């Protein structure tokens, strides 16, 4: 069911934060553990700020905190080009339950279209289920990221789900879960943007995990 997939997502969601060495942590969004010490996280969380590699990354797993130099996480792309969401290996994180087999197969994408879905996410650790209206797939999606200083960047990704719904700051990194029980309520991807009552998630397929 949607709710049981949601429980598996919930248990693998951590809070992602960034800070300078010896400084306060800025808690930005969610990251989703997928297998071993690998997580999915929107790279817009960190990549557009100055000297990101000299920062410390923080992972909050239910009130237990894990930190690491940004230079010591291994970042792997989902596909060619910029997809925002990346795979990130964090050596200091406790091993995750392998949830990769719960993600949609590329070939099954059409089966999630025109059906409801649920965004399974948090706002700074408080779990939320956000209803999304019948889904469409945009071959290219563009959204605006506001950086810490106030300036903005336009981001464009390939293959992003679009659904009617109401989101809040901090919900990025949560997982979109299909209502379609015939594909075992597959995880469809990772929430990256929202506005004007529309929610956008980058497609993440099972096949993408072959990038190790």
């Amino acid at each position: 069911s949607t709710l049981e997939i949601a429980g598996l997502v919930r248990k693998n969601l951590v809070q992602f934060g960034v800070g300078e060495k010896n400084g306060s942590v800025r808690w930005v969004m969610n990251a989703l553990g997928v297998k071993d010490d690998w997580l999915l996280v929107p790279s817009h969380a960190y990549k557009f700020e100055k000297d990101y590699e000299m920062m410390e990354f923080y992972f909050n797993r239910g009130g237990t905190y894990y930190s690491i130099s940004a230079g010591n996480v291994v970042i792997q792309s989902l596909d060619v080009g910029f997809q925002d969401v990346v795979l990130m290996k964090v050596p200091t994180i406790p091993k995750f339950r392998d949830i990769t087999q719960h993600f949609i197969k590329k070939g099954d994408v059409p089966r999630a279209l025109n059906r409801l879905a649920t965004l399974v996410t948090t706002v700074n650790g408080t779990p939320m289920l956000i209803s999304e209206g019948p889904l469409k797939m945009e071959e290219k999606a563009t959204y605006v990221h506001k950086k810490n200083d106030g300036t903005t960047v336009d981001l464009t990704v390939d293959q992003a789900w679009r659904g009617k719904g109401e989101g809040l700051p901090g919900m990025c990194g949560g997982a979109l879960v299909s209502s379609n029980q015939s594909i075992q309520n597959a995880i469809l991807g990772i929430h990256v943007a929202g506005g004007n009552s529309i929610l956008v998630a980058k497609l993440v397929t099972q096949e993408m995990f072959q990038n190790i």
Binding site: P42, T142, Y143, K146, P169, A193, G194, G195
Partner: peptide, 4 residues
Amino acid sequence: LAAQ
């Protein structure tokens, strides 16, 4: 759309 804004990055959330």
